[PDB]
A paper describes a structure:
In a similar fashion to M64, the sulfur atom on the linker allowed 40 to adopt the required conformation to fit into the binding pocket. In addition, the pyridinyl side chain of compound 40 had an enhanced overlap with Tyr258 compared to the phenyl side chain of M64, which suggests that 40 could have an enhanced π-π stacking interaction with Tyr258. The crystal structure revealed the binding is dominated by the π-π stacking interaction with Tyr258 and the hydrogen bonding interaction between the amide linker of 40 and the side chain of Leu207, similar to that previously reported.
PQS and HHQ interact with the C-terminal ligand binding domain of PqsR, resulting in a conformational change that leads to the activation of the pqs operon likely through the interaction of the helix-turn-helix DNA binding domain of this protein with the pqsA promoter. The pqs system is crucial for P. aeruginosa pathogenicity and has been regarded as a promising therapeutic target to alleviate antibiotic-resistant infections.
Residue numbers in the entry:
A (entry chain A), B (entry chain A): 94 to 296
Amino acid sequence: NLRVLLDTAIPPSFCDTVSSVLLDDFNMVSLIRTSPADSLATIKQDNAEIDIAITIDEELKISRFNQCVLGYTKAFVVAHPQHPLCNASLHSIASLANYRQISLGSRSGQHSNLLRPVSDKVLFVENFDDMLRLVEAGVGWGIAPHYFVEERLRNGTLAVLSELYEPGGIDTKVYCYYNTALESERSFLRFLESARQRLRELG
Amino acid sequence: NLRVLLDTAIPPSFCDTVSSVLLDDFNMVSLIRTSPADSLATIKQDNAEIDIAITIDEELKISRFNQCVLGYTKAFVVAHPQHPLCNASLHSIASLANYRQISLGSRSGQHSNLLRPVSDKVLFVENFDDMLRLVEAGVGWGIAPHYFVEERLRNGTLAVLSELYEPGGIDTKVYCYYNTALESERSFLRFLESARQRLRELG
Ligand SMILES: Cn1c2ccccc2c2nnc(SCC(=O)Nc3ccc(Oc4ccccn4)cc3)nc21
Ligand SMILES: Cn1c2ccccc2c2nnc(SCC(=O)Nc3ccc(Oc4ccccn4)cc3)nc21
């Protein structure tokens, strides 16, 4: 058995890439979604007995685990078109601190620098669906994965605020935290390459 | 007068891109190198009266300033070829914690998550030259900008340790911290685009 964590920020396609690859070497292969806010929190419980986390979140040293980049994935800051900040420009791209944000919450209650919300006006949720619902009701703005918002953007339901901050949306790194145990074994090195490849070329 | 900070991690070519662009709008334009470890520390002194910092370092809210991405730049983890970790593989890519690192030091004495060294065996320096000298004498490993190490890598003097962590070297974001003042003024928006462009296409 090889237990595996992908946070909800990882595209569902990546999910297809990994899985295929792993079954080449491994016979029993359990997959687990989690909020990016609960990813590292989860693996840090020994009982949870995770072997491989694929998450966007960062933490420097975690006991028992090693870290590496698999690649990068986009997110966008989004709101209801009519949302005050509709107009995108730089005075808006500091104003966010003043507006209500819909950020992911964490079991841990705590957030990492990467994921801790930016405004003091915050409304916590567990997953990006809860988030985007509330945001479609112009209740706030929020950041969510590219994949989640592709649809709604074309279907004029949602507007982007991010561009004048990071054009092309906000690239963030995808980490593989893995059990030190695996580092030696070629089984993993195999995954890692084959994974990495199909992620970039199709990233 | 427009005062400008580029940390030493920013390529010297970028330096050419910015400068040209700014003089189109601005008549007096002072440029200032700094260690990436002193970049933010500097601008936070009001006396230093900086208008625009181009740095790799991150900090969430800084009073008086706004933040945005200009792009991404590579670094590599390097050592003397004969260095114990020569062989690169995953057991090495946790072993770094155990080896002597040559990290940048800071006037501030303090380091940000991004820049704070990884091993407990550390030797501080001010600039990447000091660093790479010591590293060519296999005294430690260290991370340094792509530009700094291109030469020496081809000239077999230095070996890379990073690949199996982040292949293609370690992409990190380049930030523009800028005086809230500028946000309105088109002069800057101009810089920002024209800058951004020539940085990516030639990144
Ligand atoms: C980074 N990131 C992802 C990346 C990729 C996928 C999911 C997430 C994801 N999901 N949730 C959260 S929590 C919110 C937070 O605190 N971060 C945040 C970071 C950049 C922000 O951009 C701007 C834009 C204009 C002006 C100032 N900042 C705004 C907020 N962050 C996420
Ligand atoms: C990130 N970064 C730059 C980026 C671009 C340009 C300059 C620097 C630059 N200059 N100095 C410093 S200080 C050292 C530190 O604490 N960071 C660090 C970060 C990633 C590391 O990679 C690996 C590799 C294998 C296993 C584990 N980690 C190692 C150390 N960091 C820099």
